[PDB]
Amino acid sequence: ILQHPDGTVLKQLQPPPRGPRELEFYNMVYAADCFDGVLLELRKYLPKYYGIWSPPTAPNDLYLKLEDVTHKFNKPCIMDVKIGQKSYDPFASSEKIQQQVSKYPLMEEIGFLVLGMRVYHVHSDSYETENQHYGRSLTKETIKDGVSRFFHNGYCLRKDAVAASIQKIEKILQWFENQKQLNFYASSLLFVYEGSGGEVEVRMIDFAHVFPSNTIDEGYVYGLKHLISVLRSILDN
Ligand SMILES: c1cc(-c2onc3ccc(-c4nnn[nH]4)cc23)cc(C2CCN(C3CCC3)CC2)c1
């Protein structure tokens, strides 16, 4: 992710087939002739899409120009959560399935994985960052506290942001409960709140493994529901 002062991020297309798939996903969704009400509603929950972008002198070098979801924040607190029971897609090999499950074998059980968080602490005027290994360390025993960490400013638990996150996730869940045409693997929710009341972003990102489907995305739903349940329990801290 490259953060542009103009309020966008540039995301470089991943190597094929993933990068091209993500381009096609955005293209399909933000198709200017798209009257599909499912895809029209989905736009609300994605970064705004400004089309494919390449440097003036390098047509080879492909990026997506996306809304920076953090842009309107002063001190954004950012958490990326991979959603679903499976982070491998329907066309993965045995090896690829094994690669994906081994990365985090609790994916089926929990239905989400914290990819990272960046949390502004007021009293130190600084950020705590957690990486891949943080979320991949979390077990059933420690997931609730693992998530809670995101909402700690080093003086209070930001229950406002927790409650707001549930409310926004709920609308995304409603979207998924009303569509049977897309299944989403290894995709994420980007949570943002103000670290400097209820000012929150929750957006879907990372679409290198979104496939056509005939069924409810049950794995994504399970993850949203479980994530909500964790967030709900945190409101009782
Ligand atoms: C500032 C802005 C964004 C961001 O803001 N708007 C965004 C829109 C899309 C994406 C995006 N799409 N695909 N992957 N990221 C990312 C966006 C994302 C971040 C961080 C960038 C680093 N990622 C990594 C670290 C854990 C995974 C966590 C999220 C920081």
Curated annotation (Swiss-Prot):
Q: What is the effect of changing residue 99 to R?
A: Decreased activity with inositol 1,4,5-trisphosphate. No effect on phosphorylation of inositol 1,3,4,5-tetrakisphosphate
Tell me the impact of changing residue 132 to A: Decreased enzyme activity
Q: Name one GO molecular function term.
A: inositol-1,3,4,5-tetrakisphosphate 6-kinase activity
Q: Which reaction does it catalyse?
A: 1D-myo-inositol 1,4,5-trisphosphate + 2 ATP = 1D-myo-inositol 1,3,4,5,6-pentakisphosphate + 2 ADP + 2 H(+); 1D-myo-inositol 1,3,4,6-tetrakisphosphate + ATP = 1D-myo-inositol 1,3,4,5,6-pentakisphosphate + ADP + H(+); 1-octadecanoyl-2-(5Z,8Z,11Z,14Z)-eicosatetraenoyl-sn-glycero-3-phospho-1D-myo-inositol 4,5-bisphosphate + ATP = 1-octadecanoyl-2-(5Z,8Z,11Z,14Z-eicosatetraenoyl)-sn-glycero-3-phospho-(1D-myo-inositol 3,4,5-triphosphate) + ADP + H(+); a 1,2-diacyl-sn-glycero-3-phospho-(1D-myo-inositol-4,5-bisphosphate) + ATP = a 1,2-diacyl-sn-glycero-3-phospho-(1D-myo-inositol-3,4,5-trisphosphate) + ADP + H(+)
Q: Where in the cell is it found?
A: Nucleus
Main enzyme class: transferase
Explain how, and how many, cofactor molecules are bound: Binds two Mg(2+), but the interaction with the protein is mostly indirect.
Cofactor(s) in the UniProt record = Mg(2+)
| Its biological purpose | Inositol phosphate kinase with a broad substrate specificity. Phosphorylates inositol 1,4,5-trisphosphate (Ins(1,4,5)P3) first to inositol 1,3,4,5-tetrakisphosphate and then to inositol 1,3,4,5,6-pentakisphosphate (Ins(1,3,4,5,6)P5). Phosphorylates inositol 1,3,4,6-tetrakisphosphate (Ins(1,3,4,6)P4). Phosphorylates inositol 1,4,5,6-tetrakisphosphate (Ins(1,4,5,6)P4). Phosphorylates glycero-3-phospho-1D-myo-inositol 4,5-bisphosphate to glycero-3-phospho-1D-myo-inositol 3,4,5-trisphosphate.
| Protein's recorded name | Inositol polyphosphate multikinase
**What organism is this sequence from?**
Homo sapiens
Lineage, please? Eukaryota, Metazoa, Chordata, Craniata, Vertebrata
